[PDB]
Symmetry: C2
Subunit: 145 residues, 2 copies
């Protein structure tokens, strides 16, 4: 149950600014290098697909991403356009745990209007501390690429 990576890149549209900042702070307390990729908090309405690239281009075996829109659905659709990305909208620790175990998920999507910050913090901790199981999943994860 140690941290699987210690670098995270986070973005949101306008709906996810508060959660994004709260989760960034948590991740700093945990000792991660944390990169904020916008949107600027002064923005009142932007389009979530415009805030995906700067996160997903940095995602790797040593760097994970967090994407936040109102529901999470749009961020997860957008992130998974990229073959090196494996993004899961998680509203529970169970879902985070399974996405990491089975799919080696490297982008965590949140719906800020439907999850409270304390629960999202738990979900992110599970995501960051769950190892990929490999084995029979390895071949499927390879194919996702």
């Amino acid at each position: 149950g140690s941290m699987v990576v210690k670098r995270v890149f986070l973005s949101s549209d306008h709906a996810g600014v508060e959660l994004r900042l709260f989760l960034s702070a948590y991740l700093r307390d945990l000792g991660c290098e944390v990169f904020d990729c916008g949107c600027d908090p002064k923005e009142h309405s932007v389009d979530y697909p415009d805030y995906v690239h700067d996160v997903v281009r940095e995602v790797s075996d040593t760097s994970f991403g967090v994407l936040i829109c109102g529901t999470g659905i749009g961020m997860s659709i957008a992130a998974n356009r990229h073959k090196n990305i494996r993004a899961a909208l998680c509203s529970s620790t169970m879902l985070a745990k399974l996405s990491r175990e089975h799919n080696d998920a490297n982008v965590l999507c949140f719906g800020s209007r439907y999850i409270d910050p304390d629960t999202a913090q738990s979900v992110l901790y599970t995501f960051m501390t769950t190892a990929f199981l490999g084995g029979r999943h390895a071949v499927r994860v390879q194919k996702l690429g």
Copy 2:
């Protein structure tokens, strides 16, 4: 509410076969054209990514898709690799509703090991009968395909 399309393509891996056949019969009873894209029920282990292509190839403004693996997580990742596809893993009618309203979702993913068939049928019904809201969502949905 009115069904938004009357054509559905469905696929699964081995974990999803039973639910896939249950939801196909449901759709048929509802008067949909229903297209089974495997896997063969005789198959006891396959790879979910191999069963996405045949569904997403057929998805359009007139045709939706349903993808099923153990969790739904892998199918949603694999589905959203394609620019014409807007897939959502839904375990509740609320998420089905929101995915349609905001994202014009055209592929519904289920986790057969984590949803009971009767709840899955409600989720699918909601998905099929919820209109896209357009409005301020249209520009973002358009960007999803760019």
